[PDB]
Amino acid sequence: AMDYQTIPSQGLSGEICVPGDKSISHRAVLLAAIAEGQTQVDGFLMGADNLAMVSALQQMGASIQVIEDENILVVEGVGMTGLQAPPEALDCGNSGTAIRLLSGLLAGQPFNTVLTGDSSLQRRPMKRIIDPLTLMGAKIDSTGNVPPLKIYGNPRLTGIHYQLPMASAQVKSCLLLAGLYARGKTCITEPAPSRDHTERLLKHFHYTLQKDKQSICVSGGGKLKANDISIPGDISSAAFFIVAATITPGSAIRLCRVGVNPTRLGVINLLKMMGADIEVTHYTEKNEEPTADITVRHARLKGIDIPPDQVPLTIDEFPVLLIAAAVAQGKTVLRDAAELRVKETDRIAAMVDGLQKLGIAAESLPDGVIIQGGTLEGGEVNSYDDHRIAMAFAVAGTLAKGPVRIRNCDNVKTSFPNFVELANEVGMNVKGVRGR
């Protein structure tokens, strides 16, 4: 077992490239696997989650070459129908995105699959996918609507028209994947926009798609065409440094080549409301995906009523955003964020606990949190095995009055394998030490 241990920072400095986008990586290798022809993937995120997806695809006869130190996959497509029946259960480790997306992929296969993962994965909710898949003709067994899932593939799904009841991109993605195998039209209606990476990669792989109103549709039985993909940096990964530089005096940093999808821009929009100093420049577009350079300077913050339309666009950044709230002047309130409770861990409970442990008055609500802006002390917090709780409290350590001990950090590598190295390079202080 490994812990992080911080000491305060005298200012972040420098220019860094965060590594690849986790969400786009999962979609990119999945689609390339069943495409026709050879897809080269740059910027692929080499973490435990994306690698678990790579493994699962290989269990089913995908032809994937992994060049770890360059962040490159070379994928030799097997076509829509080229997958083979895996002999064992697919272990998705800690990755929610992998189990929910694979389920959509696997539902229309002419074979059977067991999908499972770690302790945390085994508590994450699956009704949200089981139900609409089932309306398309899937059979999926589970106890208590959590993994493991046993999927009795049906190569004769029929498309549905379906409204998301929570703003979930995984659910939307799961269903479009199934949609490519179903007879007729599949249409997802989404009341509140969620991350649209799947949509973009379909267009990229020259599967036609159609926006309608709030709706997006595909028809089953089209063909996916190989096309090289270059993955921009994960702005979720950049979010830790964006905060860290915001709250640490004397900080000024440039973050190169980060993805700036507006459906992912939450944390920047919200920090800006709070008074932060954040410049977005040099806009590109490689492979449908907006990419830009982000400059961050130390600024003093003010508490906000987080407007609830930003919740979907910030869902992964609330752990680190709440560190910002803790050291703002005044009160911050988060509402309509109950989704935070069903993540890798319950993120509202995890953040209330560690913030209190570090001297912050923070109060839980069933769908959010009330934070009273204050002063971070040193002490000890628990990560609850959640990568982003670990990384948020490593950020907190930059301003905290004394050292911060963050217990159990091995799952940081699920989304950010070089976090410590990049944190130290720009002037945070974070070190791996033995745990218990």
Residues flagged as binding site: 22-23, 27, 96-97, 124, 168-170, 316, 343, 347, 388
Furthest-apart CA atoms within the chain: distance in Å: 61
**Closest separation between CB of residue 155 and ligand S3P, Å?**
25
Q: How many residues bind ligand S3P (CB under 6 A)?
A: 11
Question: Closer to ligand S3P at the Cβ: 201 or 428?
Answer: 201
What does 109 interact with, of K ion, ligand S3P, none (CB < 5 to 8 A by kind)?
none
**Closest separation between CB of residue 170 and ligand S3P, Å?**
3
Q: Find the catalytic residue in 91, 316, 385, 386.
A: 316
Report if residue 170 touches ligand S3P, rule: CB under 6 A: yes
Binding residue numbers for 3-phosphoshikimate: 23, 27, 168-170, 316, 343
Report if residue 173 touches ligand S3P, rule: CB under 6 A: yes
Report if residue 164 touches ligand S3P, rule: CB under 6 A: no
What does 94 interact with, of ligand S3P, K ion, none (CB < 5 to 8 A by kind)?
K ion
Cα separations (Å) of 205 from 53, 287, 413?
19, 10, 29
Q: Which of 6, 9, 23, 408 binds ligand S3P (CB under 6 A)?
A: 23
One-character DSSP codes across 107-161 = TTSSSEEEEE--TTGGGS--HHHHHHHHHTT-EEE-STT-S-EEEE--TT-B--E
Please, which of residues 89-128 interact with K ion by CB under 5 A?
94
Which is it for strands 2-6 and 90-91: parallel, antiparallel or unpaired? unpaired
Containing 365, the helix (H) or strand (E) segment is: strand 361-365
* Long-range contacts of 202-208, Cβ-Cβ distance < 8 Å, separation of 24 or more: 202/31, 202/176, 203/288, 204/229, 204/287, 204/288, 205/31, 205/35, 207/180
**Closest separation between CB of residue 100 and ligand S3P, Å?**
7
Q: What gap in Å lies between CA 287 and CA 82, rounded to an integer?
A: 25
Q: What gap in Å lies between CA 190 and CA 194, rounded to an integer?
A: 8
Q: Which of 316, 317, 385, 386 binds ligand S3P (CB under 6 A)?
A: 316
Question: Closer to ligand S3P at the Cβ: 244 or 315?
Answer: 315
Structure token pair of residue 328: 């703002």
Question: Which of 167-175, 203-211, 239-247, 292-300 is the region at the interface with ligand S3P (rule: CB under 6 A)?
Answer: 167-175
What b-and-e string marks burial along 185-209, b requiring 16 or more CB atoms within 10 Å of the CB?
Answer: ebbbebeeebbbbbbbbbebbebeb
316 tagged catalytic: yes
Question: Which of 114-122, 162-170, 226-234, 301-309 is the region at the interface with ligand S3P (rule: CB under 6 A)?
Answer: 162-170
Question: Closer to K ion at the Cβ: 94 or 332?
Answer: 94
Instruction: Show which residues are catalytic.
Output: 316
